[PDB]
Scaffold this active site. Structure first.
Site, short mmCIF file in Angstrom:
data_model
loop_
_atom_site.label_atom_id
_atom_site.label_comp_id
_atom_site.label_asym_id
_atom_site.label_seq_id
_atom_site.Cartn_x
_atom_site.Cartn_y
_atom_site.Cartn_z
N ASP A 204 68.66 34.69 149.19
CA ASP A 204 67.26 34.25 149.03
C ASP A 204 67.04 32.83 148.70
OD1 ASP A 204 64.24 35.29 147.38
OD2 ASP A 204 64.55 35.11 149.57
N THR A 205 67.92 31.88 148.67
CA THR A 205 67.58 30.54 148.13
C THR A 205 67.46 29.44 149.17
OG1 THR A 205 69.84 30.10 147.37
CG2 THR A 205 68.38 31.04 145.70
N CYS B 169 72.43 25.65 138.02
CA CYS B 169 72.89 26.28 139.20
C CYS B 169 74.32 25.85 139.59
CB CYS B 169 72.00 25.87 140.40
SG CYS B 169 72.34 26.84 141.89
N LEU B 170 75.15 26.91 139.54
CA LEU B 170 76.58 26.65 140.02
C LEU B 170 76.58 26.53 141.54
CD1 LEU B 170 78.01 29.56 137.73
CD2 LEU B 170 78.92 27.25 137.75
N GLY B 171 75.59 27.13 142.21
CA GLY B 171 75.56 27.15 143.66
C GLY B 171 74.96 25.88 144.31
N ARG C 150 60.04 38.26 145.64
CA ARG C 150 58.73 38.30 146.25
C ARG C 150 58.31 39.71 146.49
NH1 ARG C 150 61.67 34.63 148.51
NH2 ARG C 150 62.02 36.27 150.11
C1 HEM Z 1 68.21 25.54 147.19
C2 HEM Z 1 68.89 26.40 146.61
C3 HEM Z 1 68.93 26.98 145.19
C4 HEM Z 1 68.14 26.74 144.18
C5 HEM Z 1 66.84 25.82 144.17
C6 HEM Z 1 68.64 27.41 143.02
C7 HEM Z 1 68.04 27.44 141.78
C8 HEM Z 1 68.65 27.97 140.65
C9 HEM Z 1 67.98 27.94 139.26
C10 HEM Z 1 66.63 27.33 139.14
C11 HEM Z 1 68.86 28.50 138.44
C12 HEM Z 1 68.77 28.79 136.94
C13 HEM Z 1 67.56 29.73 136.56
C14 HEM Z 1 67.44 30.01 135.12
O1 HEM Z 1 67.80 29.08 134.33
O2 HEM Z 1 67.08 31.17 134.83
C15 HEM Z 1 70.04 28.90 139.23
C16 HEM Z 1 71.21 29.47 138.69
C17 HEM Z 1 72.24 29.98 139.47
N1 HEM Z 1 72.28 29.83 140.86
FE1 HEM Z 1 71.25 28.64 142.04
N2 HEM Z 1 69.81 28.15 143.37
C18 HEM Z 1 69.99 27.81 144.71
C19 HEM Z 1 71.07 28.23 145.49
C20 HEM Z 1 72.14 28.96 144.98
C21 HEM Z 1 73.31 29.36 145.78
C22 HEM Z 1 73.44 29.14 147.28
C23 HEM Z 1 74.04 30.16 144.97
C24 HEM Z 1 75.42 30.82 145.20
C25 HEM Z 1 75.45 32.02 145.75
C26 HEM Z 1 73.42 30.07 143.61
C27 HEM Z 1 73.95 30.64 142.49
C28 HEM Z 1 73.51 30.51 141.24
C29 HEM Z 1 74.10 31.03 140.07
C30 HEM Z 1 75.49 31.81 140.06
C31 HEM Z 1 73.40 30.69 139.01
C32 HEM Z 1 73.68 31.06 137.55
C33 HEM Z 1 74.36 30.09 136.61
C34 HEM Z 1 74.34 30.56 135.14
O3 HEM Z 1 73.55 31.48 134.85
O4 HEM Z 1 75.08 30.02 134.35
N3 HEM Z 1 72.30 29.42 143.73
N4 HEM Z 1 69.80 28.58 140.51
O1 LIG Z 2 68.31 35.67 139.33
C1 LIG Z 2 68.23 34.69 140.02
C2 LIG Z 2 67.68 34.61 141.48
C3 LIG Z 2 68.68 33.88 142.36
C4 LIG Z 2 69.01 32.43 141.84
C5 LIG Z 2 67.66 31.56 141.79
C6 LIG Z 2 66.64 32.31 140.85
C7 LIG Z 2 67.19 32.53 139.37
C8 LIG Z 2 68.53 33.26 139.42
C9 LIG Z 2 69.57 32.51 140.40
C10 LIG Z 2 66.30 33.74 141.42
#
Ligand code: HEM
Ligand SMILES: O=C1[C@H]2C[C@@H]3C[C@@H](C[C@H]1C3)C2
Length: 405
Positions: free
Chosen positions: A242-243, A348-350, A177
């Site tokens: 930030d999520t 999303c792994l998270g 943002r």
């Molecule tokens: C409500 C919470 C969250 C949402 C809606 C969310 C959403 C997303 C989305 C939309 C992507 C893929 C984006 C793309 O394809 O470019 C992503 C990937 C990822 N997110 Fe989540 N995120 C959330 C929370 C988290 C948390 C808490 C973590 C851990 C610290 C996390 C870690 C990751 C990682 C490591 C990936 C990458 C996986 C890969 O590239 O193979 N996220 N997230």
């Molecule tokens: O680069 C990233 C930021 C943090 C999380 C959610 C979204 C896409 C990925 C994984 C913004």
């Protein structure tokens, strides 16, 4: 500030949507985006804002384009182009098959098995934070809960000082943002300046924290490079900081306005999980994209090599063709359809962590503070970007209606 329409773009495909500042913002961020899905709007639009880029408006296209890494490359996932270009996070700025070894390591760190180990802390922090607020009869939920809860868990996981939060949080925010205060590359570098020495330290002397494990990991049989570790850790930070934080404020703003929804959850807790998914669909908040690796014709539109396309994950579950009466929150939908955590190889792994945090908040808040509302005359402001957020969330309640646990 609109960029001139490139030659390949049919003018009838023009729809100037500003992902950073959509026109209907006052209505709510989800409601501002949802303009994209009105009858007057073609399935695939070109916006002249933020340098010019396509936007897929429907769940069907978003999924397709997410599946298709051959054509839609993660190499430049952020808009504007300069951001997408400075973007070097792992495994996010990689396509299969390269992404796989990295993902596999990221998963060691944040996956289910870790969640399971952190459970009691998540519970402990939530109950501690809520109990502390309860007797007040008023907080700033964004600052008082949504921020500390998830961030203190992450800080704990990563083995980083709670003191670093404010600095860290500012930097992460500049990335999702942007304020104009800093360019992406600058924000990226500052984050990296932070991380570098830590990584060094953890390569020499390993902890059990997330950073120590990434810094010392194996990928494609050999050891991760220091630059590689820095690039994964950078992502883990944005993800953690930030999520969840933004997500909980949207959900709490809704619960505050909807007593009937609160009640339901109180009486029939068996529905919490289902409610969580429905909230994840309704208050979806992420929008990133892809870059065309080459000339391609997608659903009759000619995309040129190098064009960027926004594939708003937020949009899929707001799409009428995917969900009947989209803007309506219904805890008993037969099928909750969304792509809130993304779709394809970058799912999303998270996510397991994100759900555990949401479900604990809901369970635990509703237990102690069943009756609350938004403060008289507070105006709730949404903020749009790569990850949307809520500015502030003033809540008020009668202490006497609370329950000490
Ligand atoms: C409500 C919470 C969250 C949402 C809606 C969310 C959403 C997303 C989305 C939309 C992507 C893929 C984006 C793309 O394809 O470019 C992503 C990937 C990822 N997110 Fe989540 N995120 C959330 C929370 C988290 C948390 C808490 C973590 C851990 C610290 C996390 C870690 C990751 C990682 C490591 C990936 C990458 C996986 C890969 O590239 O193979 N996220 N997230
Ligand atoms: O680069 C990233 C930021 C943090 C999380 C959610 C979204 C896409 C990925 C994984 C913004």
């Amino acid at each position: 500030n609109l960029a001139p329409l490139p030659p390949h773009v049919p003018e009838h495909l023009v729809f100037d949507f500003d992902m950073y500042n959509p026109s209907n913002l006052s209505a709510g961020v989800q409601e501002a985006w949802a303009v994209l899905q009105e009858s007057n709007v073609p399935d695939l639009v070109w916006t002249r804002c933020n340098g010019g880029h396509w936007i897929a408006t429907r769940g069907q296209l978003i999924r397709e384009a997410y599946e298709d890494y051959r054509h839609f490359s993660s190499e430049c996932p952020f808009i504007p182009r300069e951001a997408g270009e400075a973007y070097d996070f792992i495994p996010t700025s990689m396509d299969p098959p390269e992404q796989r070894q990295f993902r596999a390591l990221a998963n060691q760190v944040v996956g289910m098995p870790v969640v399971d180990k952190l459970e009691n802390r998540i519970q402990e922090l939530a109950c501690s934070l809520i109990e502390s607020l309860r007797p007040q009869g008023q907080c700033n939920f964004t600052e008082d809960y949504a921020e500390p809860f998830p961030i203190r868990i992450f800080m704990l996981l990563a083995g980083l000082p709670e003191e670093d939060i404010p600095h860290l949080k500012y930097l992460t925010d500049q990335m999702t943002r942007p304020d104009g205060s800093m360019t992406f590359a600058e924000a990226k570098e500052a984050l990296y300046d932070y991380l570098i020495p830590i990584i060094e330290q953890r390569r020499q002397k390993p902890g059990t924290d997330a950073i120590s494990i990434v810094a010392n990991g194996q990928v494609n049989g050999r050891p991760i490079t220091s630059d590689e570790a820095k690039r994964m850790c950078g992502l883990l930070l944005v993800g953690g900081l930030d999520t969840v934080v933004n997500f909980l404020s949207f959900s709490m703003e809704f619960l505050a306005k909807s007593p009937e929804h609160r009640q339901e959850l109180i009486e029939r807790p068996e529905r919490i999980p289902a409610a969580c998914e429905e909230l994840l669909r309704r208050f979806s908040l992420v929008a990133d994209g892809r870059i065309l690796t080459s000339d391609y014709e997608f659903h009759g539109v000619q995309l040129k090599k190098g064009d960027q396309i926004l594939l708003p994950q937020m949009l899929s579950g707001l799409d009428e063709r995917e969900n009947a009466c989209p803007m309506h929150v219904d805890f008993s939908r037969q099928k909750v359809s969304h792509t809130t955590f993304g779709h394809g190889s970058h799912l999303c792994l998270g996510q397991h962590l994100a759900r555990r945090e949401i479900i604990v908040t809901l369970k635990e808040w509703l237990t102690r503070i069943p009756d609350f509302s938004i403060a008289p005359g507070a105006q709730i402001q949404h903020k749009s970007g790569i990850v949307s957020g809520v500015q502030a969330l003033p809540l008020v309640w009668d202490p006497a209606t609370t329950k000490a646990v």
